[model samples]
Target: PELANKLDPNAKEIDEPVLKAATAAKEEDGKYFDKDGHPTFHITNDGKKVDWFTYSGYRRYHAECHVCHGPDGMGSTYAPALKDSLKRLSYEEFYGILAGGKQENQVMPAFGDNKNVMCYANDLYVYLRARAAGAWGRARPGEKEDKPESAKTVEKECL
Candidate 1:
């Protein structure tokens, strides 16, 4: 698959940040929260540690999502841009997509085994949400902005 090949290449060249993020585990009670702090499975990085979220998510995105989603979530034709996708999709919907690959073109493979996939999905969601709102310079309350341009995109969709 051209998309897969472009995104994962040798899979050996995957960056350290991505690896670190993807390989990192979370505590049993560690899950993501909504803006109101409600409990969920989406993990957020607190700049220092993985916080109550999963760290493996970072690795999975680089190994799987970066090619089509763009580093900043601008999205290529293969995938929808996620910068402000939260507005269009609910957290449950997003989680569903991750757990079950899309039926449309089967572009996304199921990541059910990777608990970190959920956490990565959550962190990516927050990052996109922040970018869409033009909150680029500041890090989310407990998170840090560390991913590079090639690993992230601005929070805007193509017109």
Candidate 2:
């Protein structure tokens, strides 16, 4: 109990700011980490209760991506399941596809303009991560954490 009352002399001080409240990725000691850090999330949200990013990803995906990836990131006859794609592609590569766009023999279009999908790219990534991890199914995602300041900034800049 006494230890809890005093700062550990050996401990390194750090900011108390909420981390990953905005920006999608950050590098520490050379390697990169996602919005919440690490490459993916393992818990299944299933529209019952979900993280903000995953929920946003679902909404944005349906708005822009479902036509291709199908209703729930499941593969469609036209396009491969994004859930499957996420398994193969890292977040950086996925963002590259969104930024520069993609074209595979005219089968898949180089998607997104400056308007919608690009703005919500991380949301798409997060949702796909959930789907890839089998944390979500057909149901829409549930409630969300409050939008982060960084996210809000991107939202404003993109819009």
Candidate 3:
């Protein structure tokens, strides 16, 4: 995929404070790592571009989550909101719900079997993190880091 946002003039840029919500502890391989060594996101060129995973996360969320959760994770009629949800839930908690699923009011099906969701779980998380923090507007990231080689490896192994 050539730069999707490069030609997109309408793509939104991230805010400075949004970086506070998800600071990169370090860079390993090609992914940004948080303090817990979990995969996270990062911004560059003064918020002009975001890490590859974050960009991918936006794509994945729109593809999988928006239908039920609503736009920008605001939640729909039955689905629970996620913009505020991430503010309260820890990373582990989010992963548990994603993999194990919820059985409360509605059935939030286990996505462990869906490689499309599971493979890019971190991406989805960070994308939500950006939205949760209100750094990114309701639009795709305009510019982004090149997809890491490790990302391809994971896609191969998972998909």
Candidate 4:
């Protein structure tokens, strides 16, 4: 979603070349997007099973973020809640903080080596997007429509 917003509205939708290039770049340089100008998780739709990756990402979140973000990312005084943060920050901001560090807090570490950060971010996005729309306690997966007011409140800049 962040990537989509970053490109021109009239820009051609992403293609295989863009996806392949983007992934190759990420693999080669630890960057998130590949040469094709697509983000890493774009390949999830390629039919490859992502269960192990998603499970592992959940484990990592429990280990790394649970201390401050809480089991369900509800916040714990130390960190802001992520349950609906996707409605506040664009995808690039989300990925930037996960992949690198946040300006608000230098203590946040870079997770570039952990590809699961991308996976987890996607999961977090889905979860928060659902929660933000007041769809709590639902076990549904995948993307949902963005609320009109929430979309207006979200930041569009890369920062």
Candidate 5:
């Protein structure tokens, strides 16, 4: 089982912020999550609290991922429900799948292009993680807060 030894049974979620995933992911070891806890991409924020990155992730997902993954990550006949898939994959696995794409019986084309997905990978990850954790609904995000200087610069420069 991919989730084996991955999450803490006692690790109740105390918070959900789109930024928690982003903040924790910036670590050097990619160990922001515990061997018995969640991946850095997990958060506990209200779905509408549109922090810059999370909001952007929502938009990017609808733009790129929803076509296959379904509206708001509910999954479709065309693809697996990412809401559940994230439960099994770690941030590293999620990232690699996105960057390089994956194929087991289905073909998920690579999204390494700077044109869209890569530039907003963290955002997409944040939003999907929220959905996976049952933190988001189908509603659009609220007003976006200012992006962090690092993410702000990247978000802008890439455009």
Candidate 6:
């Protein structure tokens, strides 16, 4: 229930670049969700510890996305900042680009066929949202919750 009240999109006032999970309406299998049921991150131990998905996102992002997006979702000389992109993009939109890829001013390849990305797209999104919101820092999460059974099962099925 941490940060549950403030997570409301209609809140008149809120902490800028929000990053606390004190407000989740529910938590399913170690992943936190806000009152609106959006995927969100949770931090504890004074922001020193993160939930499993967030950490997993960090790992996945580095492995799959960081090459062009830069470390911690920071933009590279060519690729744009994904953290910034997430601020304007809906979850569906984010996944749309991931699934289809993009070609224009900036090029991005489709990941629809890459199980490494499709399987953990939510994790990637959650991680970038955290970065954009300033909930977590640039460093690797010092601590993390144990990976849930659901995550393990998904990994088994997806891999």
Candidate 6 global Cα RMSD: 4.8
How would you encode candidate 2's per-residue C-alpha lDDT over 104-141 as one tens digit per residue?
64455555665677777767886786666455556775
Q: Write the per-residue lDDT of candidate 5 for residues 1-159, one digit (tens) a residue.
A: 211112223444323333233344232232223343443332223333444555778889898888988988889997998877766677778888888888876899988775567877767766777666555556687645555566655668887
Error (Å) of candidate 1 at residue 65 is 1.2
Clashing pairs in 6: 1-22, 2-21, 2-22, 2-23, 3-22, 3-23, 4-22, 4-23
In candidate 1, residue 17 scores what lDDT? 33
Taking all chains together, each candidate's TM-score versus the true structure is: 0.47, 0.67, 0.82, 0.44, 0.68, 0.85
lDDT of each: 0.44, 0.59, 0.75, 0.43, 0.61, 0.77
- Mark the 10 consecutive residues where model 1 has the least summed lDDT: 1-10
Better of 5 and 6 by lDDT: 6
Q: What is the lDDT of residue 141 in candidate 2?
A: 56
Give the per-residue lDDT of model 3 (tens digit) for 1-159. Answer: 111122123435433354454667678666776666666666555446777877999999999989999998888898988877877777889999999899876889899888889988988998887677655667669888788898898799888
**Between candidates 1 and 2, the lDDT winner:** 2
Q: What are the C-alpha RMSDs, in order, of all predicted structures?
A: 15.7, 11.1, 5.4, 14.3, 7.9, 4.8
- How big is the RMSD of model 1? 15.7
Off by over 4 Å in 5: 1-47, 156-159
lDDT of 6 by residue, 1-159 (tens): 353322234333233745443245688888887666778777676667788878999999999989999999889987998877877787788999999998886889999999988999989988887777766667897688898898898899998
Q: How many backbone clashes does candidate 6 have?
A: 8
Better of 5 and 6 by TM-score: 6
Best by TM-score: 6
Candidate 6: segments with Cα more than 4 A from true spot: 2-23
TM-score of 3: 0.82
Identify the runs in model 3 with alpha carbons over 4 angstroms from their true place. 1-21
